Amino acid sequence: METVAAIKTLIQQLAQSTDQFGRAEINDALRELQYSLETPFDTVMRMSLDTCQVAVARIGSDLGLFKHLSQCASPQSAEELADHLGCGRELMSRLLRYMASVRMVQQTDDIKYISSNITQTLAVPGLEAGMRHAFENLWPVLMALPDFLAERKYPDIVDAKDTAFQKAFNTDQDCFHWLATQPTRIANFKVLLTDERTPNFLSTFPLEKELGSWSAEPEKALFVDIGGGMGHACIRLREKYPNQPGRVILQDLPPVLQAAQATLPLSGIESMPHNFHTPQPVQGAKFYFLRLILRDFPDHQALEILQNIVPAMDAESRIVIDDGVPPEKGARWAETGTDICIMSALGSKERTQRQWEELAAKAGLQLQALYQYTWPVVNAAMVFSLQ
Amino acid sequence: METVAAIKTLIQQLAQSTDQFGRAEINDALRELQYSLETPFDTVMRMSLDTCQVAVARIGSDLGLFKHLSQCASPQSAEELADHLGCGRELMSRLLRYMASVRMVQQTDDIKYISSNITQTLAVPGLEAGMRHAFENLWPVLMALPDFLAERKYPDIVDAKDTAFQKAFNTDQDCFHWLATQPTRIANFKVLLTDERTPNFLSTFPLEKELGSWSAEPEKALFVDIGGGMGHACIRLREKYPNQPGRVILQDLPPVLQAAQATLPLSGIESMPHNFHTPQPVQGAKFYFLRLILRDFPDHQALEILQNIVPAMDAESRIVIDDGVPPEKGARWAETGTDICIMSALGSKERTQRQWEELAAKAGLQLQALYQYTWPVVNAAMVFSLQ
């Protein structure tokens, strides 16, 4: 119908007319409209069949389909793709037909296949690794969660060693300890670390305002990236603020620091092995930065991580928690799904602003400023000082 | 956004003005817009988190939350629902926040909870049973598919006894034989059978024109519903054509005929126990009807089912296959996802019109007429005669 074609045109034109945050708001609206207008049968069909996407993405990734199609200059037949990738012809035709129906590839008028936006995404190593993590790590924990909760008469989960994870992978270890003994998972996790989220806190963080008159003299630390992974925050800080003095220090475990060396600048960023369960060695830094760290820990462990930093602080030192700050009400699926997943796997939780302030108060900290940098799903740099 | 409220108003007004087929077209367009507009990170988040929906629906079902909320007259607090249903209060608060974010319930401005469209759907026994089936039968088979295809170097799956199912449930039994040994699963399937799809073939089936001069004496059957389940097709036939002569006969296995009795009219429809893997007892029927039967069998078994019927047929007899008829190209997610699920669990497949005609020719049948009754996902009554 011309009506459907016109709806598509108007929504694309409105999407192009706004920014990434406007487009995120439109996408959530489109989802809310689908759910509101689907029939009861459609609801069950959707819940039944949308689980297919991750499995079929896992297969495409195993075959190298997404990478191959992303490099192809012309439409490919199912036959050409099957013979090239070493797949049964009929299986490849069925997988491609399914993939086209969910835009994981596109199907042409003459029943050939080209890259979509999603083909290209699943071709990117860091994003492919996310999809692989969802299949091998998240799926099993969600599959265990209902019977786990039933067996245990619906407990409030508060312990990383007593959640669905232990049922899912038949172990008494917490997720973090268990992953160390699984080379396949560590390799994928290693690739997942290379994905850099955009935008980042530096888009809205008023660094010069937050600095005040803080002196890098004689030899003080500007920024200590605690569990900084590949040190994207350190790299982006040095890139945005090349003239601000002070040590910029990436802190992580030796294997992650080794992985980071390749892509770290040759000067200006220190690689310091540090376990964030031990006292913070760098004294009187301006910013102690924790990005997507504390959300992976229940309150007891998150508190201990903060308590390990507080004694290193000057009056001018700030702890900067860069993490999810879902609202009190009307939280979006991306903030609320993450909460169920980290409950199931890690025994942890998403925290509202009030819950972040209650946690930080136990560590003797007070919130000075909160700088949101994503919308409508809230990620913010929360700036904490000594009480 | 005023923009988002405006899009919702426009789509809702266009949705209300069209019919169910028009709303299904709009819904498919909103999905495609969503995928096309998505960022690479959104794609991975969606694939990571959308499978939460089934796990959380299953937990809500276990707690009886959806039936409870559907019968509440006023908005309920998380604490009221947790206390009433026997759930940890923090667990219940988090589940409800997640459910509200995906419209499985509605959250009020007061942070209390009411029934949405989806909470009513998940309270309907037949539809709840569809969601439990997705969780306990489909999820494990989709979980097994990628590694099963990898280990076996991407075979064309062709055998019910050799597909993802056997790896998922650690068995050499086919799905149908295995399910029959599992009481809780058998019980869920019987509730699943109580769901009647709408619309149905009688909306576009020109019965009078197909009958022509056909006569019901001596004691001939107008309609034999082979695997008719609750016998909804028999009920609708007798409701729509109450004065058309000829016996109307529900065929299924004894336990399903037993379950059908309470819903069946007192006269006009015979309950005849009959295994459709055995020779058809009713001779010279006008219509031998197979609704959503053959798609659950690979060609070899589907052919055996048809070959059990053909010897009972007159020149006036028709086999009516009422089933999915996906197009040669541009097939929708609801008819390609089904294909991947039935490949994985049953070793079967969706069939294009031409694939149905090829199968039916091997049984000595030729397509007389094809009567579509759903759009844009094709279900049709295909009328076959002896060739």
Ligand SMILES: C[S@@+](CC[C@H](N)C(=O)[O-])C[C@H]1O[C@@H](n2cnc3c(N)ncnc32)[C@H](O)[C@@H]1O
């Ligand atoms: C979500 S990942 C990367 C987060 C990083 N801040 C970012 O935003 O790119 C969490 C990081 O914590 C690190 N990590 C885990 N346990 C740690 C520990 N005990 N001490 C220090 N780093 C740790 C991991 O190696 C990983 O790089």
Ligand SMILES: C[S@@+](CC[C@H](N)C(=O)[O-])C[C@H]1O[C@@H](n2cnc3c(N)ncnc32)[C@H](O)[C@@H]1O
């Ligand atoms: C998809 S379900 C119901 C389909 C039904 N025609 C309808 O549209 O409602 C398949 C039906 O086949 C029945 N069935 C399964 N195996 C059977 C067999 N060997 N003989 C007869 N009926 C069988 C089941 O009991 C069930 O009612």
